[PDB]
Amino acid sequence: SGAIYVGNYRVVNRHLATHNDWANLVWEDSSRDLLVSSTTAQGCDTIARCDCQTGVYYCSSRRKHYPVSFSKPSLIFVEASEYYPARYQSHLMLAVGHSEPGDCGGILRCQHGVVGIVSTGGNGLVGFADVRDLLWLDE
C-alpha cells in the first residue's frame, strides 16, 4: 500500500484504488497501473522533474529504505495476475532490490522529489511506475 499526495491529487496503484478513489477519479491508465483521484486537503509531496536513474525506495516488507539504480521508463512485459491479463506495462523502471506484492505503493525518491511508486517485482527485482512525465500534477 501507499500513495503520493501532491496539491489536490492522490496518486495510487490502479489495482489498489478504493471505492472513494474511483468516485473522485481524475485520470487512470491500466497500461501504467496508475490512478489519480482528487482530494480536499493539500498534499505533502513534491514531484521530481529530472532524468535521475538512482534513488531510494521504501520497502514495507522489510520496514526499510534501500538505494537503487533503475532503468529509464519503458514498455516491459508483465505476467498475468488476479488484477490484470498478461500485457506490456508502460512507463515502468526496473531495478535490483527486494519486493513482495504488498510493497506496491512504496515511494521511490531522488534528490529532486518523488519519482514513482512500486508497481511490479519478483526474484530480487523491483519495478516502479514513473510519475515524472505527469506535468499536470503540479498545477
Ligand SMILES: COC[C@]12C[C@](C(N)=O)(CN1C(=O)Cc1ccccc1OC)C2
Ligand atoms: C498480486 O499481483 C499484484 C501485481 C500485478 C502487478 C502489475 N503492475 O501488473 C504486478 N504484481 C505483482 O505482484 C508483481 C510482484 C510479484 C512478486 C514480488 C513483488 C511484486 O510486486 C511488487 C501488481
Ligand SMILES: [Zn+2]
Ligand atoms: Zn532527480
